[PDB]
């Protein structure tokens, strides 16, 4: 009963050389590709990478795998995949990717009766996403996923999208493991890259991300604003509290510098300064300005000490010069 399909597979793999691409001496093997993004994984800012789980499909025509039988499509397992020629697709910006094999190699092979193949695989690609954190945390990146054909030159193997390029990378609705960004849309391109060996066709897929500033407002922005405001309320105190105004100033300085130190975790040690660092520096300057004002008042103290004019001018100008800066900093970036 099952002998008819067994001799079909035996007639297929007889005289078959898997070391040779289809049409090695006659044409170019065109590989049709599409990617189903099952789950866009978390983006590691410190390592400048991102994770993605996808159903990589490759389709190509093999004329040596023609058969005439009672079944049009041979839905086969992963053992047949290693006995035939498959393209050597690798990821150009990948770092460490895993082809899942629990409980059996997670792959697919459907030979139609003309020679068209379909080779799907489940993969979790950790790819390089180079980041430009000059507008951190109100930044938007385009993390690429480049893939091509290790060893197969443009004259041998070319790659193409099997659907329209706007519709050839599909992201599932429930598949979003991003807890910091949000995936704003996909973008593909196809190019020709040159190396020491030859010209290769490279397929680039861009994933346009955008950071959500909800963690950092509560993490640093709002504590730094409250640290400034708690230094702002020291001007309403008694002029002669030589030590009370002192503690306000030194504890605002301590909280400001520990917020400045702690607001550098999980993003890499870049040489430049982020927008959050500029907010840190301006709030730091407004904290130290309170101690400069208190040192001036304590230098100018001596039947009863009177209210300092430096204190009355700092009760109005110091909250207003903070309100000017926040309307400038939160427009400059949040605008676009």
């Amino acid at each position, epitope marked *: 009963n099952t002998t008819v399909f067994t001799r079909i597979l035996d007639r297929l793999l007889d005289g078959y050389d898997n070391r040779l691409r289809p049409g090695l001496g006659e044409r170019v093997t065109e590989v049709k590709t599409d990617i189903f993004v099952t789950s866009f994984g978390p983006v590691s800012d410190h390592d400048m990478e991102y994770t993605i789980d996808v159903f990589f499909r490759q389709s190509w*025509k093999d004329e040596r795998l023609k058969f005439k039988g009672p079944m049009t499509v041979l839905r086969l397992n992963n053992l047949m995949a290693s006995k035939i020629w498959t393209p050597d697709t690798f990821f150009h910006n990948g770092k460490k990717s895993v082809a899942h094999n629990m409980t059996m190699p997670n792959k697919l092979l459907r030979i139609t009766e*003309d020679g*068209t193949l379909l080779y799907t695989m489940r993969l979790t690609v950790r790819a390089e996403c180079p980041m430009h954190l000059e507008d951190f945390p109100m930044d938007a990146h385009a993390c690429p996923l480049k893939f091509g054909s290790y060893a197969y030159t443009r004259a041998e193997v*070319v790659y*193409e*999208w099997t659907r*329209e*390029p*706007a519709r050839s990378v599909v992201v599932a609705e429930d598949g979003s493991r991003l807890n910091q960004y949000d995936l704003l849309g996909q*973008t*593909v*391109d*196809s*190019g020709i890259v040159q190396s020491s060996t030859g010209e290769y066709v490279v397929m680039t897929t861009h994933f346009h991300l955008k950071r959500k500033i909800g963690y950092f407002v509560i993490q640093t922005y709002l504590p730094c604003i409250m640290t400034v405001i708690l230094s702002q309320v020291s001007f309403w105190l008694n002029r002669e509290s030589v030590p009370a105004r002192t503690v306000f100033g030194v504890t605002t300085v301590l909280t400001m510098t520990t917020l400045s130190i702690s607001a550098r975790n999980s993003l890499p040690k870049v040489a430049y300064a982020t927008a959050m660092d500029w907010f840190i520096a301006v709030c730091y300057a407004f904290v130290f300005s309170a101690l400069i004002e208190f040192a001036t008042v304590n230098y100018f103290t001596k039947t009863f000490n009177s209210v300092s004019k430096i204190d009355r001018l700092s009760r109005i100008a110091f909250p207003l010069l903070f309100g000017i800066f926040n309307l400038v900093y939160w427009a400059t970036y949040l605008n676009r």
Partner: antibody, heavy 116, light 105 residues
Framework: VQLQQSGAELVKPGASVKLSCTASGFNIKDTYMYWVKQRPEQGLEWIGRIDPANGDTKYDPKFQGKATITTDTFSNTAYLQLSSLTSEDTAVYYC???????????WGQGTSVTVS | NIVMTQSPKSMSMSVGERVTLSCKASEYVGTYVSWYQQKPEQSPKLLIYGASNRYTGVPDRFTGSGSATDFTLTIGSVQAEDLADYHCGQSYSYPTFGAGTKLEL
């Protein structure tokens, strides 16, 4: 490598016309087939899409309903069905093979339709 | 859709000099445009695929150039047999084209 089309047509407005092109040198199940409209002294207007291996069709929203595309495997031939012909439908039609990097490689000679 | 807005409508120059066209895209099309010639009483033939890729049989004088949105086609030392009509397409989405550019003496 050659795309041969039918002859020119001349029917009354409000009728329907059958228009065809037969592909040679390859099989239509591999590459997509594209239909396009060339009005005289105007630009190209894409009609629709067909994938013959899958049977899927996608159409221009201004051409939806009034034009549909069919295929058959044995004849290696793509067809048009035009309905409710008017004065603005007087143009010349080409069927296009999808080529390398989706570029419309091969074009049929062109089939002229005329209403009266 | 994607709207191709190639400019100008017609150019009238002599034989043996440099002339360039310009194709503008309303949305992002990434190196997926195409360039065709349209002789009178003749079907279109492909010239450029991708963004700047010369098709087989095209002379070396026909050089394109591409980007994410702005596209151009440069002609070097145009001859008399190149006097035809040029069209810009795209295929990053469902395909559209542009009105076209003509050439005159």
């Amino acid at each position: 490598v050659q795309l041969q089309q039918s002859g020119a047509e001349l029917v009354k407005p409000g009728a329907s016309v059958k228009l065809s092109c037969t592909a040679s040198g390859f099989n239509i199940k591999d590459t997509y087939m594209y239909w396009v409209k060339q009005r005289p002294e105007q630009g190209l207007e894409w009609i629709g899409r067909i994938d013959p291996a899958n049977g899927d069709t996608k159409y221009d929203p201004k051409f939806q309903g009034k034009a549909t595309i069919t295929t058959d495997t044995f004849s290696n031939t793509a067809y048009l069905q035009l309905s409710s012909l008017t004065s603005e439908d007087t143009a010349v039609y080409y069927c296009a093979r999808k080529g390398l990097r989706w570029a419309m490689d091969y074009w049929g000679q062109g089939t002229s339709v005329t209403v009266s | 859709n994607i709207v191709m807005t190639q400019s100008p409508k017609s150019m009238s120059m002599s034989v043996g000099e440099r002339v360039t066209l310009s194709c503008k895209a309303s949305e992002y099309v990434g190196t997926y445009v195409s360039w065709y010639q349209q002789k009178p009483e003749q079907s279109p033939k492909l010239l450029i695929y991708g963004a700047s890729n010369r098709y087989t049989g095209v002379p070396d004088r026909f050089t394109g150039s591409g980007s994410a949105t702005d596209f151009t086609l440069t002609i070097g030392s145009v001859q008399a047999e190149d006097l035809a009509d040029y069209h810009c397409g795209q295929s990053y989405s469902y395909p559209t084209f542009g009105a076209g550019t003509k050439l005159e003496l």
